[PDB]
A paper describes a structure:
[name] folds the chromosome of [name] and related bacteria. The [name] protein [name] dimerizes at its ‘‘hinge’’ domain, which connects via the long coiled-coil ‘‘arm’’ to the ABC-type ATPase ‘‘head’’ domain. The heads are bridged by the kleisin [name], whereby the C-terminal winged-helix domain (cWHD) of [name] binds the ‘‘cap’’ surface of one [name], and the N-terminal middle domain (MD) binds the coiled-coil ‘‘neck’’ of the other [name]. [name] also recruits the dimeric KITE protein [name].
Author numbering:
A (entry chain C): 246 to 294
B (entry chain D): 1 to 290
C (entry chain C): 1 to 147
D (entry chain E): 81 to 213
Write the structure that this text describes.
Amino acid sequence: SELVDKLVFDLQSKLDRIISWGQQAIDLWIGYDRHVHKFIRTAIDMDKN
Amino acid sequence: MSEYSQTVPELVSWARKNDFSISLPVERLAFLMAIAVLNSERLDGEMSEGELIDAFREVCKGFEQTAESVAVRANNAINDMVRQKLLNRFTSELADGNAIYRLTPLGISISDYYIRQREFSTLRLSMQLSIVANELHRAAEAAEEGGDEFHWHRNVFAPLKYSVAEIFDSIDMSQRLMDEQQNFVKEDIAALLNQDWQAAIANCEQLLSETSGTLRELQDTLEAAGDKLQANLLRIQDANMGSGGSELVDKLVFDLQSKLDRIISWGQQAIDLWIGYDRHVHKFIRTAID
Amino acid sequence: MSEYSQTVPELVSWARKNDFSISLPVERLAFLMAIAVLNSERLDGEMSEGELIDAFREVCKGFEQTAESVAVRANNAINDMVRQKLLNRFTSELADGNAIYRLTPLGISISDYYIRQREFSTLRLSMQLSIVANELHRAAEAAEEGG
Amino acid sequence: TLIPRSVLSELDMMVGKILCYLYLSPERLANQGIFTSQELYEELISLADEGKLMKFVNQRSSGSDLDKQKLQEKVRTTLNRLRRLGMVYFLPNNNNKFTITEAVFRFGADVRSGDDPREIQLRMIRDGEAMPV
């Protein structure tokens, strides 16, 4: 049934999008987290007097 | 605690403090819809700045607008959508400064209202009523089995709050869609009567009867399922009262009963309004024929 | 059939022809949210014109606006909300000439986005995944049963 | 004065104070003084208010890439002006990299003494070192 095949294909495409979004969000958050930690370490520790 | 914790004066003060506003003229709304369509055709649900600019160019072409400053206009439109909370922008150092865009829940809700052809379906309602009946029956069985606060939170409160409440909201939305469809039929009856009223009497009677039949079928489906749903909500309420009584489960069951009463009352009120219009159109036809 | 049956050029031509637009300044948006809160507290999900004018009066007080011509401004706001497809107006002879108003799916989606405190819940997601897993499993068993 | 006098732009000051912090930074001393325009830009956006600073490039900026590239090009231009003033030297064969000099410390004239900022500013304007805007 072309109607069921198309509907199943659409749901599979939505599921792939839902799974892919989480990994992408984690990568973006990691980039920011690393940057904030680097910034804090630079601000705190490198001035010594 | 009421889903809407803020009184009207607190809410108006909050809205004024945050300066929330939506300004979507025909060109901006068309662009939002074009973005929503382009996003739905993609595998990653993400759009780059260049792709958004290409989409804006196609809208400007459809509006026969000057190709001058299109890149600037597209940037102003993109910034306006971000500023109006329709788009989320992600600026990663890892992406060499290239911003990634995703539509917000608001931008998707507005674009879907115009692009998604939502038709009232008795089959959709019957399916939603079948799923909610099964979910309410499982929650009622779990409530009657008894247990600790963790059993009640995971097997009674979570299904009522994150499944039954959402399906009731979906049914309510379908009823609001039916309200819009009735207003569309009213405009069509007024138009048929303004063009050729003598040739429109048969068509108007058919539209009136078909709309009446659909509203009755819907109300019959809601009344037949509504009692079983009310019985399961009462079973949960009795079980809660017997096992100490969580005020949170009681408030949630009361909210669901109130929503269910609104859903059942809407069908009767829609039928009464439709009966009033039907009589008015027949009176108008009689007066015009006389 | 793609949920969106129309290509981008067809959609743009269609939107241009129907002249669809949304204009909700801060006051009109606050009026919409006020209507949504008032409707959620009610048993019938319906609002009368007098109740809408009172809701608008409460918004005007919040914007520190003069009480002069509030009824005219309220009627214009109500007509604008109906024109923008945010409110459905029902005029029944049976309601003694009084118009009934109900929020449209668009008016509910816009008002809920700002007023409903939507927070991400792992429990909500786990429940949704459990329901879809059972629904997909039943649909797969039905597809394998044939018919 | 017999010779005319002029003042630097606020963007020049932002780039000046950032070049000053870069000179001091022991974390980057390993580069042997060689810095890249991208590193300067990254440090600047790390410290100052990005979206509010964008107001100077264009009154309508809201984070668009075209506007971000415009900001980078203005930075590239002002940095070239600072080179003529002798505050920074480009590499002999590569123009994307450059070296700092101690002359940049004049951008710290408002904070080298741990005292009331207002009084410092008054003292500076009295000495002819700096003007307001």
